[PDB]
Structures are given as C-alpha cells and as structure tokens.
Design a protein around this ligand. Structure first.
Ligand SMILES: Nc1ncnc2c1ncn2[C@@H]1O[C@H](COP(=O)(O)OP(=O)(O)O)[C@@H](O)[C@H]1O
Ligand SMILES: Nc1ncnc2c1ncn2[C@@H]1O[C@H](COP(=O)(O)OP(=O)(O)O)[C@@H](O)[C@H]1O
Ligand SMILES: Nc1ncnc2c1ncn2[C@@H]1O[C@H](COP(=O)(O)OP(=O)(O)O)[C@@H](O)[C@H]1O
Ligand SMILES: [Mg+2]
Ligand SMILES: [Mg+2]
Ligand SMILES: [Mg+2]
Ligand SMILES: [Mg+2]
Ligand SMILES: [Mg+2]
Ligand SMILES: [Mg+2]
Lengths: 325, 325, 325, 325, 325, 325
C-alpha cells in the first residue's frame, strides 16, 4: 500500500497532510534537554514541536532549518533534522506495510545541495520523496499556476514565485531573507529603541508582531505588556510595529515588480490581478491593501492573501502527489 | 456518401468550409503542454486552434506552417501538422461512412515538395485531396478568373496571382514573404525604435497592427496601452504603424505591375479594373485607395478588397470541389 | 549493597534522610568537654547534636559550619567537622557491607575550596559523595525546577536560587549572609537597645526569635521572660522582633528581584507565581504575605513557604541520589 | 582615375575584388557594442566583419542582409548596411582621386525595391554602382553563359539561374529561401531532437555543418563536442547532418528540373552537362554526385562545384565591370 | 576640481582608492563606547575601522553592513553607516574645493532598496556616487569582462558573477550568503564539536580560519592556542578547518556550474579557462586547485585567485570612474 | 564653589582625598567613652579615627562598617557611621560656601540597600555623593580599565573585579569575606593552637600579621613578643603566619580564575598580564610571586601589587569625580 505526504517543512512550522487525512501542524524545532536534570524533567531524550517550544526554558531548542534550507552549521543539526523529520513522518501514523511517498516544500531557489540534503534526509524515513518550491506547491494548491505571482511570505524566507505558467521556475523564483523573522529582529530593535528599559528577546517581539502586525494605517492601539528590569510595563508599540512590518514590503514589492516585468506583456495586466500572499507573513493586517497601493504604478492589482495560510503549502504538495508517478 | 472540403490552410488561420455547411475558422496552431504540469493544466495532450493560443502562456504553441508552406524544420512539425489537419477535418464533423474530398489552398508558388507534403499529409486523413493556389481559389470564389489580379495578402505570404484567364499559373503567380507577419516584426521594430522602453513581443505589435493598421493618411489617433518595465504606458503608434504597413506595399505594387505587364496589351486596362485584395492584409485601412494611387502610372485602377477576407479562400476551394471529378 | 544519603548539612541543623527510611534531624554541633571535669560529666570525649547543645553549659560547643561553608578558621574545626559528619553517617545506621552514596547540600555559591573540603571530608566516611546547592536540591524536592525562585532562608545563609530550568546555576544562585543568625544578633541588639538592663546572649534572642518572629503586622503580643541582673523580668519584644526579622527581607527581596530580571521576559510573570521560601527562616510568621506585598512592583507574586522546612533540603538530596550514577 | 569593384555582397560573407588586386573576404556583419562597457571593450563605436563575429559575445552583431536582400526591418539596418558597405569600400583602399565603379551581386529575383536600396546605398559610397544577379555574375566568371545552370547555393538563398544564353533572366532565375542557414536551423533541430540535453545555438550547428555536411553516403564518422548543461559531451551527428543537408536538395533539384524544362529541347541535354554549384552550400561533401543521381531522370548530368566558392561571385562582377560603360 | 573614489565597501573591510593615490584599507566597523567610562577611555565619541576593532573589548562594535547590503535592522545602523562612510571619505583626504565622485561596490544582486540606501547615504558625503557589483568592478579591474566568471568570495557574501561580456548582469550575478563569515560560524562549531571544553567565539575561529583555512589535502598541521575554562590549550584544528572551508565550496561550484551553462555554448570552454576568485575567501589555501578538481566535469578549468585580494574590488571601481561621465 | 571627594570608606581605614589636596587616612572607627569616667578621660563625647584606637582601652570602639558594607546590626551603628562620616568630611576642611561632591567606594557587590544607606548617610553631610566599587575606582586610579583584574584584598573583603572594559560590573565583581580580618582571626587561632599558653586577642595577631605576613617561602624568622599568663614570651610565628596568609589565597585565586574565564578568549592572555592586587592585603610579602605561581595553569601571569595601597582607592574616586556631572 501507498501513503502520500504533504510536508511543508517550514522554518518555523512544519505542516503536514497525508493522503489518509492527517492535517497537522507543528513547530519545526527540536528540544534537547540541556543537562542531566533537563533530561529528567523532559522525560525523554528530546522533544519536537510545540512541546519543545513550551519547555523552551529548559531545553536547548534547535531549529533545524533557518532560511528554510535545512541547516548544516553543525554536524548536530543533521541529527536534529532527522528527529524533526522522523517525528513528522511518524505523526503521519503509518505502517507497518506503508510505503511513504512525500512531498516536501522548500524555499524556492534553495540550492541543489540543500534540496539534496533534504532529499537524502527524507529518503532515510520515507522511501520516495520529492522536493519542490513552497510557493509553487501553494499555487498548485489553488489551481493558480498561470500568470500568477505568489508571494509566500513566511518566517525564514519570503519566496516569490511567478507561476509563469507551469514550468515552476528558477529565474521565476525569488527568495528574500527579509521575512517574518527579520521583522521580529527588527521590531525588537524598534521597540528597544524607544523603551530602552524594556527586555525583549525576539521571542517576545515575535509575539508582539503576531498579535499586532499590520501595515499602513494603524487600525487600533497596539498596547502590550512588556517587562522592564522585571517590572511589568504596558507600552505602545504601534509605531514600532508599523515600522517593522513595512520593512518587509519594499523587497517584496520590488521583487514582484521584478517578476512582473518577466511575464509577456500581453499578460502582465492579468498577472497583477493574480498576486497572492501565502504563508505566515501573509497574515499581516492590511497587507493586501498596502500592496495594492504599492503596485498602482503597475496597474490595478488585485492582491489576495490566501484563505488558511497554515496549510496551503502542504495542501498543495499533497494534491500534487495525489496525482502522478 | 461524399463530403467535400474547402480548407484554406493558412499560416495563421485555417478556415474551413464543408459541403454540409460548416464554416469555421481556427488558428493554425497547435499547443503542446511544456511539461508535466502543463499537461495537467491543459487537460489533454495537445490543443489546436484558438484555445491553444489562449493558453499560449503555458503551451508551446507551434505553428505548423510558416510561409504557408507546410513546415519541415523539425520532424516534430510533421506531427504538428498532422494534429492540425486531423483537427480541422474532425471539426468538419464527418462519418462514419463519409468519404472526404478536400481542397486545400496553399501559397501560390509553394514548391512541389510542399504540395506533396500536404497532399500526403491530407491523404492520411481524407482520402482524396487537392492542393491549389490560395489566390486562385479566391478568385474562383468570385468568378474573377479572367483578366484579374488577385493579391492575397495574408500573414505569411502575400500571393499574387494573375488570373490570366483560366489556367491558374506558375509564372502568373508570385509570392512575397513580406506579408502580415513581416509587418508586425517591422512594426515592433518601429515601435521599439521610438519608445525604446517598451516591451513588445510580436504578438503585441500583431495586435497593434490588427487594431490600427492603415496606409496613407492617418485617419485617426493610434493610441495603445503598452508596457514599459511592466508599467502601463499609453503611447502613440500612428507613425510606427504607418511605416509598418506601407512596408508591405512596395513589393505588392511592383509585383502587380509585374503581372500586369504579363497580360496581353489589349487587356491590361481591363486588368487594372479588376485588382483584388484578398486575405487578412487586405483588411488594412485605406489599402484600396493607397494602391489606386500607387497604380496611377498604369491607369485607373479599381482596386477592391474582398467582402469577407476570412473565408474567400476556402469559399472558393469549396465551390471548386463542388464542381468536378 | 548500596545506601544513599540526603544530608542537608546545615549550619545549625543537619538533617539527614537515607534510602532506608531514616529521617533524622540534629544540631550541627559538637560539644567537647572543657576540662577534665567536663570529660567526666559528659561521659565521652565529645558529643554531637542536640545533647551537645543541652550540655552547652559545660561543653565548648563548636559549630563546625558557619556561613554554611565548612569551617577552616582552626585546624581543630576540621576534626569537629569530622565528628559531626562521622556522627551523621553513623546515625544513618549502616553496615557492615554498605556502600554509602551521599548527597550533601551546601550554600549555593559556596567556593570550590569549601565544596572540596566537604567533599574530601565526606569521602573519608562515605565512599561516594555529592555536593550540590541546598536551594536547588530543595527545589528538586518539589519538582520545581523551572521558572522558580527558591529562597532558602536558613541560619547561616539565605540562598536564593533561580531554578532557571534545570541547569542549577552559579549566576542564578545568590547567597546572603544576612540570615537567621543575623536576625538574632540583631534582635538582641534591638532588645538590648530598649531594655538595656537585660541580659541577652544570642542564644536567648535566638529563642525569642523562634518563638515570636514575624513580619509586617504584629498579630499578637510578644511577651518574653528575660533576665536582668539575674532578676526575672517579663518584657515586650514586639517591636524588637518586628525590626529584626524585617531586616532580613530587604536583601532577599532585592535578590529575588535580581534573579527575576535574569529570567527570559516571557517567563517572569510565571516565575513570580513560583517563589518559594524554604528552610528555617521560611518559618517566620507572615513572611509569605510580607513578600507578596514587597513584590507587587513585579506583579502578582504567589509566594509559598514550604510544607516542612525541616527536611525539604535533604528530602531532595535524597530523591536526587535515588535517581542516577 | 577609375577603380572598379566586384562586391559579392553576401548574407554571410561579403567578398570583394578590385581592379587593383584586392581580394578580400569578410563577414557581412556589423557589431555594435551593447552598452557603455561594450563600447569600452570594443575600442570603437562599431566593428564590421570577422572581428565583429569574434566579439560576438559582447556585441550585438547585426547582419545587414538576410535573404541576401538588404534589410529593412529596422531603420537601424540601413545604418548597418551603410557601415558594412562603407567598410568594404574603404577596405578596397582607394583615393583620394579614385572614382569607384562597382558591381554588386544580389540574390537573383531580389525585388526592384531591394536593388534600389542597394543601389542607393552604394551610390552613397561609390559614385557608380551596378547590381546584378550573383549566380549570373558567377557564371560570367567562368564563361558559362550559355546552356548552363548555375546553382549558387549560399547562406541565405540558393539562387539558381539558367544562363539561357545571355540575357540574365527573371523567369530564368529562381531563388529559394532554403539555403545554408536553413540547413543549420534544421540541423540544430535534428541534433536537439536526438540529444535533447544538448545546447545548440545555430552558431554551433552552423559549425557542425561547415565541418561535416555532406549528402548521400556518410563517408565518415561525424563526431562533435557539444555541451550539455555546460558539460562537454562528444556526440555523433552523422544522421542529423545527413538529414539536414539533404533537406536543401529537393528544392534545388526540383528547381533545376524546372529551369531545364525552360530551355529549348534541342539543348537540354547539353544543359545538363553544364550544371554548376557555386557558393558556400556548393561545398557540401558529395553534393556533386548526389545531384547527378537526382538528375538521372533527365539524363547524364555532369555537375560541377566551382573551384573556389569564396570568390567566384565577385570574381565575376569584377571581370564584368572590367569590360564596358 | 574633481576627485574620484574606489570604495569597495565590504562587510568586513572597506578598501578605498582615490584618484590621487590613497590606497587604504579599514575594517568596516564602528565602535561606540558602551558607557560613560568607555567614552572616557576611547577619547572620542566613536571609532571607525581597525582601532575600533582593537578596542573591541570595551566598545560596542557595529558592523554597518552584514550581507554586504547596508543594514537597516536599526535606525541606529544608519548613523553607523554614516560614520563609516564619513570616515572613509574623510580618510581620502579631500578639500576644501573637491568634488567627490565615487564608486561604491556592493554585493551583486543587492536589492534596489539597498543600492538606494547607499546611494543616498553616499550622496550625503560625496556629491556623485555610483553603485556597482563588486565582482564586476573586480573583473573590470583585470580587463576580464568577457567569458569570465568571477567569484568574489568575501565575508558576507560570495558573489559570483558571469561577465557575460559587458553588460554587468542581474541573472548573470549570483550571491550566496554562505561566505567567509559562515565559514567561521561553522568552523567554530566544528571545533567546539570536538574540544567541547574550548571557548570560541567566532572572532577566534575567524582567526583560526584566516591562519589555517585550506581545502582538500591538509598541507600541514593546524595547531592553535585556544582556551578552555581560561586555561591555555593547544589543539589540532586540521579537521575542523578542512570541514569548514570545504563548506563554502559546494555552493560556489554549483553556482559557477550554473553560470557556465548560461553562457553560449560556443564559449563555455573558454569561460572555464577564465574563472576567477577575488576577495578574502579567495585566500583559502589550495582553493584554486580544489575548484579545478570540482569542475573537471565541465572541462579543464583554469582557476585563478587574484593577485592582491585586498584592493581588486576598489582598484576596479577606481579605474571605472577614472573613465566616463 | 565646588569641592570633590575621594573617600575610600574602608572597614578599617578610611582614606580620603579632596580636590583641594588633602590626603588623609584614618581608622574607620569611633570610640565612645564607656562610662562617666571615660567621658572625662576622653574630653569629648566621642572620638573618631586613630585617637580612638589609641584609647581603645577605655573606649568602646565601634567600627561602623564591617564587611565594608555600612552596618545595621544596631540603630546605634547608624549614629556611629554618622560620626565617622561627619568626621571625614569635616577633616576635608571645607566651607562655609562649599558644595561637597563625593565619591565613596564600597565593596563591590555590596547590596543596593547598603549603597543606599551610605548614599543617604552621605547625602546628610555632603550634598551630592556617589557610590562605586572600590576595586573599580582603584582600577580607574591606574587607567587599568580594560582586560584587567583587580583584587582589592582589604580587611573586610577581598573584592575582585574584572575591568571587563569599562562598564564596572555586577557579575564581573566578586567579593569574598575571607580578607584581612579573617586572616587574623585565623592567625590567632594558628598561634593559640601551638602556644596555647599565649594570650592573643585579634588585635595582637592583627599586628603580628601586619609585621610578618607573607606567603610561600619564609624569607625570615617571624619572632614576636607575646604574653602568657602576663609573662613576656618571645615565640616563633613563622608557621602560623604562613598558614594564615595562605588561607586568603585559595579563594582569590579561584575567583580570579573565575573572572578570567569570563573574559573573551581572545583576551584572557592579556588579562593575566594585568592582574592587580590593591589594598592592605596586597601588602602581604611574596604575594605577587605566590599568585604568579598559582596561576601558571592559566599562563604567564604578571601580577602587580599597587604602588601605595593606602590611597589608590580614594585616589581613583577622586580622579573620577574630577571628571564628569
Ligand atoms: N498573525 C501573524 N502576523 C504576522 N506574522 C505572523 C503571524 N503568524 C505568523 N507570523 C509570522 O510568519 C511566520 C510564520 O509563518 P510560516 O508560514 O510558518 O513561516 P515558515 O513556514 O517559513 O516557517 C513567522 O515569522 C511569524 O512571526
Ligand atoms: N587568509 C584568509 N583565509 C581565509 N579567509 C580569509 C582570509 N583573509 C580574510 N578571510 C576571510 O574573507 C573575509 C574577508 O574578505 P573580504 O574581501 O574583506 O570580505 P568582504 O570585503 O565581503 O568584507 C572574512 O570572512 C575573512 O575571515
Ligand atoms: N602590611 C600588611 N600586611 C598584611 N596585611 C595588612 C598590612 N597592612 C594592613 N593589612 C591588612 O589589610 C587590611 C587593611 O587594608 P585596607 O585597605 O585598609 O582594608 P579596608 O580598606 O577594607 O579596611 C587589614 O586587615 C590589615 O590587617
Ligand atoms: Mg513557509
Ligand atoms: Mg491566407
Ligand atoms: Mg539550611
Ligand atoms: Mg552568396
Ligand atoms: Mg568583498
Ligand atoms: Mg579597602
């Protein structure tokens, strides 16, 4: 028997669909206990996913992918990734006589090396595996494979991928490193710039951003409970957050504009009425409309942010390997 | 039972009439999907005609005839043509006990080799097939088979054909390569000369030309929405277009003059009052009158551009094989 | 066979648990008889523990640890500590074929020198021995190894130890010298300040404190029978005692505040709802609530004083070496 | 003083002879540098001839003649041609008091328009200029001006020209577009058909063809070093090349047959014993003999391929204007 | 009067040449004193360049460019960059009546945003400024502007730039983030993997790498004096270092291979005999030869590492704006 | 007008410098007469400084700081400290229109409470006052603010302070309680251990120590005139004294080692060549060299004991507030 997988193996969240109807999401992160006590507390030699990030306190949490690309700045990060992947496959619940055929998404324009490392690292766990551009397999998740831009803004990477009809490209892709994560790093700097007394780690501003990110007009008051020398402080982050999230957008815009001019002229109009935002960063409030406005120089853009950014990635992959060799 | 066909198998549009009252037109073009995704998008292994040119984005559209002559610069282009032809016959709707007798038009003075390739390639689909000059079978479509010039200006080829009474000639024919398509290539160069920022492919200027082509006096403002680095730009193409379409005409004129002087002197006066333009290029605005003027040195020309350039080709063929063995 | 020990080797009270179910407590103190008559009275060449402190009159009682750290301000104090330790092991009742594995607590941030001197001095008596922070092994005694402060207020030392998850720290520890004992010294001075006729030694005020210590609101009348020029005098020590015990607290508070601001901001809220007081000084009346109030500037603290301050120290140690190499 | 020129102004090579004993050949091509860097690299504002084609990399090389006819699909191509022509005259080395009388060859049956454009464009550089059929001025180059066919196969055009005695014709000429260049386009398609991994541009297959072209029997192994995804690959092109170059020949043959039947019957036997191949395409291996065989239905052809295809064109022109007004 | 500048504004080292014969190099880094004492120690409100990195101890050293791109993850980093740039211009020594025309290099395929931020930020200091690809302005520094690859491996970025003749590209560029810095991060992880007791910061391994980096065969013993718990330790880093620096190379190779296949086939051979390494990372021992070997599948590469990696960057820029508007 | 003060407010000796050139030293101690006769003898209601310690016989001498920290184990000790401080300011000789700006040193890592109590208690006497780490203000007294350890060994406290560049730390400080005084206590015990007939108070051994303290090799005979049952006895204290003063050192060493491993590895070598001993305990004979030897495991230490331990403390403070707001 055969089981196929959609694995959008994201730098922060790995989503997974299976032919047999698992949707599940998890954090792409593996906790190791830090010492012999951690090991005790944790009750197992490592954790993966959201439990790891709950116990983030007393585990060394290791993201196995940053810049989406599967990491090798340590010989350890290979073992991490093994765990992660082992765990996502295992949490697909399959066997004993189940032949796992998988689709993995990566960042578009992730090197052959890194596609090979995944591919290898999957071909350790699943027998047959397939590595495609996230943004494309998004697009393929919506039948938008034609005269379309996607802009997966994610965490690690904003990928932007003209679906210049069907061939999923490698000059029709683009990736920026300015993505979610960089917004937080920034945001944090934007808050620490103005309430210099604050403690923020990035995991804080991460959450400020998730909760109040927007662009353009501030539609409300962005008030958040930070700490300062340990003391609770409520503070206004409207302006940090504005700044932060409208620091993604320049690059995305310019890099749509760039893809747009790659399409045949007869179709550019039509492309613009197909610009998509998928992935986390596509949940920014007012994004849509901020883009529209940024693109008026190219025409009437109709920008849409997908329905459920959480799975469109895998949804696609899945459908994709519902359908071939 | 017997069914006969008029197939004006043109380089850009293949028109077809049948004895049983199909008129239909289609683009002479066959799309293949480019990759395994295309194949999916397209829903079939190839398309032919105007759907192919809609999906031009993500299909490799292959015209199977350029210079009208049926192409062999690939072993593939034979299969293309098969598809085209298969499809035009099939869209004539005939069977199961229907013996297809066909007339195909070609460019006048298309080589015996090429007439044989069609003929062969039709005798694969229809049982009995007949390949004549387009311009003649136009002329035969209007009872102008005597002391007449036609000038089929088409896409690929302008053919020009003295209907030196009845024998349809091979020194009374002429073909130029400068035809529609060459107007576009040119036009495009004429626009890209002056708004060097523009993108044009030829399929754009094609459309500029269809929409604003004229000769002589510019009767209006030729304003068109081009792209520049992706940005919409409205621009004035009156002068490009003038230039472009009055780059057909020299050769046509000289080649009428040339046919004219082939006729017996007693009749040349009379010929001139019979010059015809058939085919697409005959839709140029002001053509008629521009020719008249070009021909004053030979006399009072009365130049006419046929009633419905779309079918006169096949109309003829049809009538033609309504009437013999 | 193997026997493991929890030895909370405190500066005033050494508690001990064994795997085989001894709990016992004793005073960390060894009496030597003062002279040849003492030796006679005492019936043995030294005592250890509460009998020593009964006979405190006519023995030279030598605490072998002050500031918890095991003392070397005499070459004698090494022999003392031997006796003490010899006696606590021996009162664990083990042999003849018993291999003693021990955990000893010290003050958190006791020097490597002093951990070595214990360690040595235990590795004289037990074969394998382990020296950890008291406060941690408390915390480990309550599964509170995460986002927790403990404050062991003891006699010698108040130790305060963030259980910044599991690694038991050395910037996440703190020790103050102001602890029990310093309260008494003080208290005494606070009583001798106002009833200057009184005799107090510290061993008196030690007992006033044990009996009436509180902080904040005086919940009752602190009347105690002191002497003056030998003459019994009952006197009111409510205000001495208030003063005395609320002279611990500043430092503790400031040093919790300090540890609190060491945790990641995302968790400080959570820490505060985990502040513990263990050890003797944690028996102060109203401590809990006085702390809560001192910490309102950091949030809603939920401060708890452990269930049985007497053993939580060793309890832990025990459990701790119930569980590894 | 007077200086006369043979200029065979070919679509790929322009040869030139002068009365004063220049033979030189050059590529009919003018490089312009592409940008402000090119301009720097090139050291001059344009190049012409073989240096242009060396620097083909970083120049926009523009052939100023395709289909031999002097191009006007750009207003630029007029300036190109100026450069070319300016340069071929200038490289004839003449002045200051030298009156240049020139013979240019064109494709036989190049329109009056195009003969006028050259003629004009020469009468800009030389004072008196003469435009004749290449094939004829070849024939005139060999005293074969009688009962002769030539077949200039060139690059752009195969011209074929009955030398129906002396009047050089315009129903005794013929030109096909299928010539050299079309062999390459084809060849390339024939190689890319079978080693679909290969890169070929036409400039490659051009070179495969020059190096291995033949017809009929493959006299050797046609092995050539192509690239595939950049990787060197040696591959066998014997069958591509067969296919390609025997795709010229049908049209040539049919068009000789056609000229042949134009001659008076008494002479056709004799004509056949005079069929010539001039020009590049006449260098195909085995051509001679392949034709012979193709023409057995007409008799014993004696087909010859001229001695030095490089100059016979101009050689003629030259001689030609060594001899009149 | 006019003064022009070559500013290779690198992420670690900014080199600068002026028309008037300054070469100088500095570290691209600005030290701010950390507190009111730092300010005192430092004697000025900020430092820039190598003094900043000497005083790295007690300054907050802020690189104003990482990933070469000029940073905006802080509103501060703009002021940094101002200082840096102010300082590099000022250390060009020019005025009072000197009009500074500059060339700045960036990473090839740095966004328009970032070219604008520099450009702006230069047009604050110099009046006219120009921002080009480092690798190109290298290539232009060696007349290698044709059928050439460069691979600037630097610190931040390895840029790899086909000099596909002269137009300096934006599909003919490539940048990787795996560059010097990433080697150190890695290396450090590679050493800390094996001598887990070691302290390394990256600034250590940075120096291990500078001193012992190689690839392929270890030509010697890589012994280095690290610290462990403060204690000097000499250790062997041959294998870490191997690992580390041969973790650049995959991406570079693949991305040459990729550029190579972008060139016209006729030239790829020739390209390969032009592959350059410029910039710091080009100082790796045995690089050359390791590449050669990696590229044997594409042919005989002749890889060269430039003469003086320190200035080729600016050298170029300089020459470049020695020569135009 | 403004007058600034260096007050190194030490637990045994308070040194003071003023801007106007007072150096003076005094004992940090206030004598009160014990009774109505003392009051008569003393001639004033209290003394402060060395007269108090002369009359130590018949005054109750109260150090107002032990452990350096300003004492509160009595409500009296606040009045003491007032007197002391009143007297050190007053002996700075300033008024009537003099605004006293002061720097007071404390033990590094003295609690905020205690810094506040001084601060308060100075802001009673001087208008503006500043409380910093002694060891830092030493270091600042020698420009050694960088990659330096100091070890102030004093009386109360040995402070040890990495001058981890400029920010004066609170994890880069350390204080031990084992300092001078603890040496004496010990020494005394070391002499009473061996000449059990002796009387020593600590004030005796204090003086033995001052006079004969050394470490390592005994460079001479330590003979001193003690009493026994009142009877003068000369006795050899070489071995007591060895023992005593080499009981400081372990902790200091371990706590340098500890700070050393806190510095960045690149600098630890360099730190070691900057280890300082300031303060009284730094007068121990052979200290320097004994440390060197203790630290060989970290490298070649170059340990220096400051020039004039008496004032380096205040010297600094002074300079310090010669230089700011
Ligand atoms: N509601 C939100 N608003 C803004 N950013 C968000 C939101 N939810 C998630 N993100 C950001 O988008 C990223 C998560 O999107 P995701 O599709 O998982 O990224 P990836 O799949 O590349 O890991 C993170 O950087 C996160 O902070
Ligand atoms: N001798 C060397 N061996 C290996 N890498 C080196 C060497 N010298 C410098 N580097 C590395 O190359 C980089 C410096 O090169 P550079 O041209 O200045 O980079 P950039 O200009 O992008 O700042 C750093 O990452 C450094 O560690
Ligand atoms: N010559 C000496 N040798 C050893 N210790 C000394 C000497 N002089 C003073 N001391 C000790 O050092 C301390 C005095 O140093 P000091 O800087 O005044 O300490 P503090 O300033 O902390 O009161 C006293 O403990 C004293 O016994
Ligand atoms: Mg994603
Ligand atoms: Mg037609
Ligand atoms: Mg205790
Ligand atoms: Mg020719
Ligand atoms: Mg560089
Ligand atoms: Mg001191």
């Amino acid at each position: 028997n055969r089981l196929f997988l959609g694995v959008d193996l994201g730098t922060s969240h790995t989503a997974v669909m299976s032919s047999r109807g698992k949707k599940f999401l998890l954090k792409s992160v593996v906790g190791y206990p830090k010492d012999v006590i951690g090991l005790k507390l944790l009750g197992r030699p490592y954790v993966v996913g959201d439990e790891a990030f709950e116990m983030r306190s007393y585990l060394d949490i290791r993201y196995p992918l940053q810049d989406g690309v599967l990491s090798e700045i340590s010989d350890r990060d290979i073992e991490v990734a093994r765990h992660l992947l082992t765990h996502v496959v295992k949490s697909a619940e399959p066997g004993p006589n189940d032949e796992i055929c998988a689709v993995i998404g990566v960042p578009a324009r992730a090197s052959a090396a890194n596609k090979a490392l995944l591919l290898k690292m999957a071909q350790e766990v699943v027998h047959t595996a397939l590595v495609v551009s996230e943004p494309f397999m998004v697009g393929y998740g919506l039948d938008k494979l034609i005269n379309t831009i996607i802009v997966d803004i994610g965490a690690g990477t904003t990928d932007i991928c003209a679906l210049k009809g069907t061939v999923p490209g490698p000059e029709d892709q683009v990736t920026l490193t300015k993505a979610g994560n960089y917004v937080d790093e920034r945001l944090q700097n934007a808050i620490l710039e103005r309430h210099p007394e604050l403690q923020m780690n990035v995991n804080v501003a991460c959450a400020v951003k998730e909760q109040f990110s927007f662009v353009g007009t501030p539609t409300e008051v962005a008030s958040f409970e930070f700490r300062a020398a340990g003391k609770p402080v409520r503070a206004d982050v409207t302006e940090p957050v504005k700044i932060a999230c409208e620091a993604l957008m320049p690059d995305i815009i310019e890099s749509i504009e760039t893809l747009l001019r790659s399409f045949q002229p007869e179709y550019q109009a039509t492309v613009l009425q197909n610009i998509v935002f998928a992935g986390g960063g596509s949940r920014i409030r007012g994004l849509a409309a901020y883009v529209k406005e940024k693109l008026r120089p190219f025409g009437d853009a109709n920008v849409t942010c997908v329905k459920d950014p959480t799975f469109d990635g895998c949804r696609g992959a899945l459908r994709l390997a519902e359908e071939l060799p």
